[PDB]
Design a protein around this ligand. Structure first.
Ligand SMILES: [Mg+2]
Ligand SMILES: [Zn+2]
Ligand SMILES: [Zn+2]
Lengths: 1358, 49
DNA sequence: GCGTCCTTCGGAAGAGATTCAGA
DNA sequence: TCTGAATCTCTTCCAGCACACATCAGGACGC
RNA sequence: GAUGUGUGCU
């Protein structure tokens, strides 16, 4: 049919061509016999017949007169549905400016006539004049005249020269302007000029001029001459109860516009006075502006009771417009809605449809079979038969519902597992029974939530539901390869009570002949389920090429584990049930079952596990009483110790040892330590408190306490929630994020005070407000992640590249958070990895390394595998299958034609939403750390210190004066096993390269109060710090000691803003000491809020604290406070104090001094040396006058902006930085996301590439054009002898990278619809319908999955 | 000796809806809120009990 | 009953207009 | 005293599905 | 059809 959607400006001739008439009366239906007026907003003559195939007057009434035009009233008889396809127009008496091209920034009229917006805005609204055709006087072609200046120019220059006001003058300016001459003059001026602001303005105007001249648009088309009207059926008037009519907004705006236009037309014929007609023209302009985009001007007009009526733009933009409400998501037929119940008798591919709901959903399907079987002859007889619900209708429903899967969707469809297909099982009731395994995927409990049923109609839809959306084919999460149909909170309790042992039984010493004997003994009551017997079990193994070889042995097991072994499919080792199964254990069991056996045994195993978990949880009576929450007998002693410590802290604070920002931190730390000690005490009193005889004397065992059972099994609970029941509740967190100063010292087994409950209510209301008020800014994150990566699909199989990112285990402060296996599993490597039998290859180059290859790599203990990444792929408009990796939902390579950019966006975007809607499950607990102060190396090995600038201590030890140092522990072999980030000013008890015993301290420091320790010795002079101006000082006259706190930029005076307080270290003779190895004096700056306990002119040593800086780092550290960071990383926001990197490598030296800010010159050894950098006086420089630097090295210190990294250290460095930062943020909350998704989002952030030089190509000098087009053009030119065009990659945030795409439809439907459509209309863009949102809006198959083959056929067809 | 006032009763901090929950001092306050709302939502049965 | 008509108040971020200062 | 840097000002965004209730729709003045 | 209020599950 069509293949493109073109948007451009509408000429008045084209507007008249659209129109089938001219509306010229402000009269709707006459509030009478419901007929349209003569030439009003509704008209049979203009738009179309009101009734189908009936003339308005009453002369033609049937299809036998089709196509003719009446004579009594002149309305052609046709289908009545042409009232929504035939537009009209309004002939404006005076020209009117389009508000979209005036008040959308930047104003097209503003930078087309080179005038400021204020001047043209005063001209349009008849408040000043503009000089068109100045002539032979002192008036330019764009000068602004007021009324007095206009009168002066009239009295003393009353020649043929004219100066008009209003939209007519602006239209004359636009029509009288030549575009090519102006463009070449601007090119001349741009080539002449040198200032960057003037260059940018001139090239922006040049771009606007080129867009105007290339397209068919004209400048004078932005001033409206004829105003088209919407067809009446798109602005209907629905009659209510009575003689009144509905309150339509578009009709009201049209009536206002028509009233103003008719009044102006009448005044233009009677020769009204000038002021009256000008005021009427201004009113017409305001009415048209209110019709086009209401509210963009000063005051939005309101219809009734002070609410602004929606214009033609308010119903196309926003969340409630034709883009996000009726095109990207619609209401559908064959759909239903009801609450859900469990029905645990089901299977993984089944659900329960109510018997009275499936009859109404599958109603046309019942009609078809009733007509086929002959029980009815027409459709009305079958309709009445179904309405009556006869005995034969239910058999027809059973026949038509047999293998017709339906889609069950829960209301927040966060990830793709929120929609799944089940084969219906008809039930009597009104609730949709849902299988208990998919409740984790749906995140659906059964406390009053409803799910929607959808009926796939076509054969293709049914097969997509059966082969793709089926709940059987959805056993792995698409975010990470972990299974998603995991038994939860009752099956795990059953399998934990079953597979467990106590040291006694009804029969314990007996030895059994198999699992059937164990089940028979348990059922007959001759043996407890927790015996310790010896069963003879025949386990199979497929260690050969798929052959199950039996190996019968006699293992020391329990009765429960032997009974459970009857459901484990053949092929799995027995050492997966011979233990106390929790939730992680059986999740691992299902995962290994899928990875070894396949999909069908895994599904059958999941069903059998659910059945035998429910059965043996019912058979146990695992209740919960009030005596199960055993209070420890030593909690109040820990309370007393902590309250004594807090009293000492208060006495230290009031004396003046610490300020009020450090008392907070230390009291939080001491109470959090006391809370953890109480939790440990109660956990030790709970887990092991089972003294039971071994049939002889007393023995110890893991407890059978119900609270501890369902806490240790992972059923429902944790250390926090269980701790709050029998330990102490702890301390709460406010909605702002601040932690409560005072803790609660009671649990939910004793009471709570009338005041402790009030304190707890702060955290409780924080938890409930956080969800409902801050899941909005996490649903926004996933929406603008989807809209930036929607058009990314797998389009190839292998691009053939040797590039790729480097993967290493992430050890950044503790043990191995993620080993190499978790980071490299299921991703195609990029080069033959070399084992430490070097010069021999371990794996080939293009092998998708699965679990066997991961085991092989871990056997040889590899530490770095260069793996292929999405961001480094060489495909155009998509990715290849090898550069992505594994599907992560199935155990194979990703299929060609799969929408991976939407799976990536959902996977990144809904741990945040889900965990910010679940912040109240811990109540309002602080959940903060204990602010660890020292480094205790647990393992054995040597130490390697990275990027350290340390000096000596007064005791001889080492003190760290570097910001980004890392204490990493290397074992005797040579591999890194432990790593720690040591902070500035931290003392070292040991050094580098020396073997440390396992379990002793190495680095000690204060968690708060970071110091400013020096490196040299001498006297210190209080330079540039005077009382009152830059420091707040208070003196104890008794001691004679001063303690001054330097103010921040807030309370510091404006005059003293250029004063920089600092401490110059000086020797005895007034000479400036030197930093060793350099010639720069030891000048050390002091930032704000810093306290100094030293006096002016006191001898010091090397490496001692001169001043202290409080940290005030207080937060609850949930996923709510902690996910503006992901938004900042994905939007690529520059931090406050960027770390200064080296733009070009070479020798570093300084030139001129104090250009307001310091000057640094980098000179290479061979090439050109034109680079100078303006370094502000704020931060010191880590490089000196005689060092060697490379590009990407840090001249200064601070947070790295993810643009310098891109432009200096390359694409791999910036993508690794973003991946690591987002992964750290998510892993802090326990979230597990594979890095393919973050790499995909980074790749979608990397699509623009600014040209450096045009070369032999057709690109411009500094144009920002898509990187794929640049690569295609350069690869095409390099095929011949021509030279390509050099470029530079750009990093745009997820908002800008989605708003600056080549398709204006996606950008318009995402955000800023007015601003996107204005630019598209001016530039005359032509959409190609290439993405997924575009085809969803249009109404086609997405080029993503099963429609990918069809789209390839269609593309290669033409 | 320093005090000069005292609360009338333990019920004066909670409302008329949250004061119908027995053992309120043992519930988490989120569960107290949900209990108050659900107690507001109850429909009268056939025979009052 | 018919009937024609002409308040103020969040909040983070980004872009584009002024406006400064500084060489 | 021209041109980057800073500041001022205007703009656009702020999750999903669903259920119940009421009220509006010109209301003033001429007729 | 839009507003206003209340509510349910996330
Ligand atoms: Mg729920
Ligand atoms: Zn007619
Ligand atoms: Zn590739």
């Amino acid at each position: 049919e069509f293949d493109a959607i073109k948007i451009a400006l509408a000429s008045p001739d084209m507007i008249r061509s659209w129109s089938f008439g001219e509306v010229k009366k402000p009269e709707t239906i006459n509030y009478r016999t419901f007929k349209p007026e003569r030439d009003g907003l509704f008209c049979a003559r203009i738009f179309g017949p009101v009734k189908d195939y009936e003339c308005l007057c009453g002369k033609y009434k049937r299809l036998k007169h089709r196509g003719v035009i009446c004579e009594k009233c002149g309305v052609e008889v046709t289908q009545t549905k042409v009232r929504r396809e035939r537009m009209g127009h309004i002939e404006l008496a005076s020209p009117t400016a389009h508000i979209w091209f005036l008040k959308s920034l930047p104003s097209r009229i503003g930078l087309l006539l080179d005038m400021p917006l204020r001047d043209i805005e005063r001209v349009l609204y008849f408040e000043s004049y503009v000089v068109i055709e100045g002539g032979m006087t002192n008036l330019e072609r764009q000068q602004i005249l007021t009324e007095e200046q206009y009168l002066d120019a009239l009295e003393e220059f009353g020649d043929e020269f004219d100066a008009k006001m209003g939209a007519e003058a602006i239209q004359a300016l636009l029509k009288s302007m030549d575009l090519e001459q102006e463009c070449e003059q601007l090119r001349e001026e741009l080539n002449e000029t040198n200032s960057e602001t003037k260059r940018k303005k001139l090239t922006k105007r040049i771009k606007l001029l080129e867009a105007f001249v290339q397209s068919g648009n004209k400048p004078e088309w932005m001033i409206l001459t004829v105003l088209p009207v919407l067809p009446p059926d798109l602005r209907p008037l629905v009659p209510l109860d009575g003689g009144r009519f509905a309150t339509s907004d578009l009709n009201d705006l049209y009536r206002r516009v028509i009233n103003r236009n008719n009044r102006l037309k009448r005044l233009l014929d009677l020769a009204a006075p000038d002021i009256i007609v000008r005021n009427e023209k201004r009113m017409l302009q305001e009415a048209v502006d209110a019709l086009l985009d209401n509210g963009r001007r000063g005051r939005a007009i309101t219809g009734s009771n002070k609410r602004p009526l929606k214009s033609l733009a308010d119903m196309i933009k926003g969340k409630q417009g034709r883009f996000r409400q009726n095109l990207l998501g619609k209401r559908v037929d064959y759909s239903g809605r009801s609450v859900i119940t469990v029905g645990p008798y089901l299977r993984l591919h089944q659900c329960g449809l109510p018997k009275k709901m499936a009859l109404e959903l599958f109603k046309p399907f019942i009609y078809g079979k009733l007509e086929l079987r002959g029980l009815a002859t027409t459709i009305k007889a079958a309709k009445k038969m179904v309405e009556r619900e006869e005995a034969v209708v239910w058999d027809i429903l059973d026949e038509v519902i047999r293998e017709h899967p339906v889609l069950l969707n829960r209301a927040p469809t966060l990830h793709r597992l929120g929609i799944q297909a089940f084969e219906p099982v008809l039930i009597e009731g009104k609730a949709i029974q849902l299988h208990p395994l998919v409740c984790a995927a749906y995140n659906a409990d059964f406390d009053g939530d409803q799910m929607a049923v959808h009926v796939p109609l076509t054969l293709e839809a049914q097969l997509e539901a059966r082969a793709l959306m089926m709940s059987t084919n959805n056993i792995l999460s698409p975010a990470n390869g972990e299974p998603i149909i995991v038994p939860s909170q009752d099956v795990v309790l059953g399998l934990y009570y079953m597979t467990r042992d106590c040291v006694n039984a009804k029969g314990e010493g007996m030895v059994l002949t198999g699992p059937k004997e164990a089940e028979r003994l348990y059922r007959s009551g001759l043996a407890s389920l927790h015996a310790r017997v010896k069963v003879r079990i025949t386990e199979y193994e497929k260690d050969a090429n798929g052959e199950l070889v039996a190996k019968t042995s006699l293992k020391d097991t329990t009765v429960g584990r032997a009974i459970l072994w009857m459901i484990v499919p053949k092929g799995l080792p027995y050492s997966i049930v011979n233990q106390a199964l929790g939730k992680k254990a059986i999740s691992k069991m299902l995962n290994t079952c899928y990875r070894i056996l396949g999909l069908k045994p895994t599904v059958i195993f999941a069903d059998q596990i659910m059945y035998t978990g429910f059965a043996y949880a019912a058979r146990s009576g695992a209740s919960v009483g009030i005596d199960d929450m055993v209070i420890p007998e030593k909690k109040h002693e820990i309370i007393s110790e902590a309250e004594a410590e807090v009293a000492e802290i208060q006495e230290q604070f009031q004396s003046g040892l610490v300020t009020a920002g450090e008392r907070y931190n230390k009291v939080i730390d001491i109470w959090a330590a006391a809370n953890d000690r109480v939790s440990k005490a109660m956990m030790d009193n709970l887990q092991t408190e089972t003294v039971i005889n071994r049939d002889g004397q007393e023995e110890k065992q893991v407890s059978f306490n119900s609270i501890y059972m369902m806490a240790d099994s992972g059923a429902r609970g944790s250390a926090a929630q269980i701790r709050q029941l029998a330990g102490m509740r702890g301390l709460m967190a406010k909605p702002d994020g601040s932690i409560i100063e005072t803790p609660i010292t009671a649990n939910f087994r004793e009471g709570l005070n009338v005041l402790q409950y009030f304190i707890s209510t702060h955290g409780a209301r924080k938890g409930l407000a956080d969800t409902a008020l801050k899941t909005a800014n996490s649903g926004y994150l996933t929406r603008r992640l989807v809209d930036v990566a929607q058009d990314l699909v797998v389009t190839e199989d292998d691009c053939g590249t040797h590039e790729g990112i480097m993967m290493t285990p992430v050890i950044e402060g503790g043990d191995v958070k993620e080993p190499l296996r978790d980071r490299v599993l299921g991703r195609v490597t990029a080069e033959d990895v070399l084992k430490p039998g070097t010069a021999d290859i371990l794996v080939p180059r293009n092998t998708l390394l699965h679990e066997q290859w991961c085991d092989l790599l871990e056997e040889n203990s590899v530490d770095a595998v260069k793996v292929r990444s999405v961001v480094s792929c060489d495909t155009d408009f998509g990715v290849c299958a090898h550069c992505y990796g594994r599907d992560l939902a199935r155990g194979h390579i990703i299929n060609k034609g799969e929408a991976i950019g939407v799976i990536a966006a959902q996977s990144i975007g809904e741990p945040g939403t889900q965990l910010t809607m679940r912040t109240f499950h811990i109540g309002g607990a602080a959940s903060r750390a204990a602010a660890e102060s020292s480094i205790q190396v647990k393992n054995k090995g040597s130490i390697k210190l990275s990027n350290v600038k340390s000096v000596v201590n007064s005791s001889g030890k080492l003190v760290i004066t570097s910001r980004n140092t890392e204490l990493k522990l290397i074992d005797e072999f040579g591999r890194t096993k432990e790593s720690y980030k040591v902070p500035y000013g931290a003392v070292l008890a040991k050094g580098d390269g020396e073997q440390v015993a396992g379990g002793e301290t190495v680095a000690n420091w204060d968690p708060h109060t970071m110091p400013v320790i020096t490196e040299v010795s001498g006297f210190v002079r209080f330079t540039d710090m005077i009382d009152g101006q830059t420091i707040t000082r208070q003196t104890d006259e008794l001691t004679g000691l001063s303690s001054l706190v330097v103010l921040d930029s807030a309370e510091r005076t404006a005059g003293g803003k250029d004063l920089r307080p600092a401490l110059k270290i000086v020797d005895a003779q007034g000479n400036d000491v030197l930093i060793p190895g350099t010639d720069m004096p030891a000048q050390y700056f002091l930032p704000g809020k810093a306290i100094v306990q030293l006096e002016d002119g006191v001898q010091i040593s090397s490496g001692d604290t001169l001043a202290r800086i409080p940290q005030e780092s207080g937060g609850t550290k949930d996923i709510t406070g902690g996910l503006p960071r992901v938004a900042d990383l994905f939007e690529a926001r520059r931090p406050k104090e960027p770390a200064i990197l080296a733009e070009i490598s070479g020798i570093v030296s300084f030139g001129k001094e104090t250009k307001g800010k310091r000057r640094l010159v980098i000179t290479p050894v061979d090439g050109s040396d034109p680079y100078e950098e303006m370094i502000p006086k704020w931060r010191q420089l880590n490089v000196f006058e005689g060092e060697r630097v490379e590009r990407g090295d840090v001249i200064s210190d601070g947070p790295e902006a993810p643009h310098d990294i891109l432009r200096l250290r390359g694409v791999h460095a910036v993508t690794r930085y973003i991946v690591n930062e987002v992964q750290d943020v998510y892993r802090l909350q326990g979230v597990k996301i594979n890095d393919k998704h973050i790499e995909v989002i980074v790749r979608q952030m990397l699509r623009k590439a600014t040209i450096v030089n045009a070369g032999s190509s057709d690109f411009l000098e500094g144009e920002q054009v898509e990187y794929s087009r640049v690569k295609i053009a350069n690869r095409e030119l390099e095929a011949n002898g021509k030279v390509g065009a050099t470029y530079s990659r750009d990093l745009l945030g997820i908002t800008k990278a989605s708003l600056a795409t080549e398709s204006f439809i996606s950008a318009a439907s995402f955000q800023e619809t007015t601003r996107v459509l204005t630019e598209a209309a001016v530039a005359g863009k032509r959409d190609e319908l290439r993405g997924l949102k575009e085809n969803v809006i249009v109404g086609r198959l997405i080029p993503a999955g099963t429609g990918y083959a069809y789209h390839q056929d269609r593309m290669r067809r033409r | 000796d320093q005090v000069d006032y005292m609360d009338v009763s333990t019920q004066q901090v909670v409302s008329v809806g949250a004061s119908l929950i027995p053992f309120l001092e043992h519930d988490d306050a989120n569960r107290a809120l949900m209990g108050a709302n659900m107690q507001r939502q109850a429909v009268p049965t056939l025979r009052a009990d």
